Amino acid sequence: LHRNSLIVLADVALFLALYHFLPFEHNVVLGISMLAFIAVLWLTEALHVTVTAILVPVMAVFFGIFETQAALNNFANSIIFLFLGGFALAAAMHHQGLDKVIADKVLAMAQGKMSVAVFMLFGVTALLSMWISNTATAAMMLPLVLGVLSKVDADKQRSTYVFVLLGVAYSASIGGIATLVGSPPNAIAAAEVGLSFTDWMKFGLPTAMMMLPMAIAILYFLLKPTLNGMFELDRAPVNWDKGKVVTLGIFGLTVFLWIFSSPINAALGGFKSFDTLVALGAILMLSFARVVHWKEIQKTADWGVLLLFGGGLCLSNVLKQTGTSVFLANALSDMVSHMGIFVVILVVATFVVFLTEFASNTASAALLIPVFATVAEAFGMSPVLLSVLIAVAASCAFMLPVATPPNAIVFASGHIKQSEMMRVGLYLNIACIGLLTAIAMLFWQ
Amino acid sequence: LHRNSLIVLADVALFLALYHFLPFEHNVVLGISMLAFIAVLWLTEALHVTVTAILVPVMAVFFGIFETQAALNNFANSIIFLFLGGFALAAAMHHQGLDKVIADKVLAMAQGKMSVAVFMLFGVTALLSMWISNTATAAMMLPLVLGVLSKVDADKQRSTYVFVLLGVAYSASIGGIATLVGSPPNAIAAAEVGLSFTDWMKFGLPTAMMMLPMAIAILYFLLKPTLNGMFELDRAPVNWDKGKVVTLGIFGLTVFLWIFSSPINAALGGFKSFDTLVALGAILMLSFARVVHWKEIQKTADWGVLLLFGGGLCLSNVLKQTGTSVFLANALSDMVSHMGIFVVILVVATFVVFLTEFASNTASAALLIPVFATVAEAFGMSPVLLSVLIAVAASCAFMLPVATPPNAIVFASGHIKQSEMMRVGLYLNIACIGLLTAIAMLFWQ
Ligand SMILES: O=C(O)c1ccc(C(=O)O)cc1
Ligand SMILES: O=C(O)c1ccc(C(=O)O)cc1
Ligand code: NA
Ligand code: NA
Ligand code: NA
Ligand code: NA
């Protein structure tokens, strides 16, 4: 009776159809049928992303592709645990309030100017998003933005409160492209091609440094009237208490080890997934230093995304085991040889940068990263490029709300019009397809 | 400065000490030192049970016992997922309120007699604990018990209102011994020795059927004055609404497949961990039938216990890989050959039935199930008996509060005295050491 129950029944139909009617070797048929089923279920979201994630292995198992335990072992990939480490580190500095003090101390560095207010609100929302989350950084910044934009309260003077709102809703998403913790897509790419933390930082941090100015510029050079106004610094100030310095010390030490993981590990006996060990060590320090309780981390952690990761890796392996990756490589051979690698990575970047407006950031990465990384592997090219590209572009949702939670968080402020966002995002999208295809060309040799 | 920070530093000391001073082959030294370390950390709970669980693999990995991915793969054992299935099934019937309707419908079957009120309160707390939880069943029953024991309000007539509180807090723990879902210890045993759902039911359900009467009898023939009183059925009645019949249908179907798993699976192609597939199927049906949302399952699920399961299996494998199981088997060879299997399982049943009063039921199972199962395996005896025994006896916490959450839940009713419980529990413990050593002898050939 409900829309989604219908999308589900239509997808079951589509599967049965493709299964019986496709004229290929059985394994390719099964792999294609499964790929389509999941693709639909994840783009429509008729079932929750996490339930479809759980649906992947139970199919693999019933259709004999894998044995139950082999299929489940995917959900314990080391990147999943690294991400759980970043979740506990965020839980820590939130329960401790080190995000509030990092907001105030930087925000009150601007003495009383709305000019240098919003610029620090974006630089903070971004710097905080590198480590915490996106939905969380945006929902945490919203009160500080509405707090600042209350002196210029005139909402007949609207264009101030869209520049300063959409700015943070974008600064959180751009800040999520800086490190392996931040947005799930990065983790799905890292799990697919086997990236370390410092590897994905060598990629994403440059792209974030470039895209945050370009995005503020684009919001600016629409309708910005904010070189005027004054500050209302209204609330109790902050002060470093029972080891907010401890939370900082652990955080700092952890991020240090994450950056210098390559030489420390090489000069330690070369452990297997050093970054994951560091993340679990973080959880341990944070628990021994008494600084955060487990109930906190259990609330903060989005276990549904951790299950998603696994479902995505399982899908990748289903495509390999069934040969659907080699089959699609053969089917695209003539197209990719008639196109350039420029053309290709432009088509990819565009396709995702716009698909992410209609569907979930992570659902889109979870679908496209496997397919592309595995086809690229069937072409015998290093899948890193396509995977990182897709993962970055999936976090470039700027048009309508519903694209990402930050958009619908700053949108529910009953002020910003649908059309305004729909056309600033339409400019920033092309801007990114540009910046991305550029950098992806420079990171070649 | 804090108690637990000291317990931790003293345990790190104990480890370093045992490590340097024990005079055995290096692997046995490392395995023993680790066993002691974890043992302490889990019995004292200086760190949260789940943080110790995470501590097990990071040690195994740094001390070269396993590779990071091998050690982590333990956290994706199929029993973990079966338990997550039972968590989603509980989330479903709680969010749906089918536990309230099952309480009301049975409670209002007793017309107006306090005699047949408390007896049905115990039969319900027990039947519900089979599937839901223990801490949860107790906290959900407390308002219904205080609701009934409000007509006999006289708390100078205390021993009525203590009998029914301790009564239900015991019916929850005994009901937790009936099925693989219920109490984690059962799941840790099932994960260690490889039990199916219908296997652990063939064991525990008899024991619960026996132990619930014996426990009501023992509470009765202390100070029971309840053949008097009348009922106050005060609250809005219940009625089967938007598919509480659906939730019932799925529940029933799931439990049916779990019971009949052996022939269905044999007559299906013999899938590997069928019960786990049934549990994930439950999560899927419950999501397609729209009957429960994922946010609900994410709140209900105790992800910390699911991580514990894994850490405990990892410990077991550390004992095997280091040969500490064979070493302790050799060290106990003369003791166990000078003892009978009666003597042995009496010492075990006693030891745990009383250790479980001082430390967490599941922390106790996670520690003792590995050590014992693996030593029994070095003696080449089927480890099932000792493991199931330990798991049942660990759920036989009846004395002080703090033993189990149900005890401390009915204890916080600012009414039941410390001494009263300490001596009903002191009788019920021996009663169990009896019943258990008995049944454990009958289940031999
Ligand atoms: O799929 C989505 O819509 C999505 C999920 C998570 C995040 C994040 O917190 O980084 C952003 C977007
Ligand atoms: O470790 C404990 O004290 C304990 C944990 C869980 C349960 C349960 O809900 O079955 C009972 C007791
Ligand atoms: Na982030
Ligand atoms: Na999106
Ligand atoms: Na139970
Ligand atoms: Na206990």
Author numbering:
A (entry chain D), B (entry chain C): 18 to 462
What does the paper say about this structure?
The mammalian SLC13 proteins are members of the larger divalent-anion sodium symporter (DASS) family. DASS proteins typically have a molecular weight of 45–65 kDa and form obligate homodimers. Each protomer consists of a scaffold and a transport domain. Structural information, along with cross-linking and computer modeling, indicates that DASS proteins operate in an elevator-type transport mechanism (Reyes et al., 2009; Drew and Boudker, 2016; Garaeva and Slotboom, 2020).
Finally, to obtain clear density of substrate in the binding site of VcINDY, we crystallized the protein in complex with sodium and terephthalate, and solved the X-ray structure to 3.92 Å resolution by molecular replacement. In the transport domain, the two carboxylate moieties of the bound substrate are coordinated by two conserved Ser-Asn-Thr (SNT) motifs, which also form part of the Na+-binding sites Na1 and Na2.
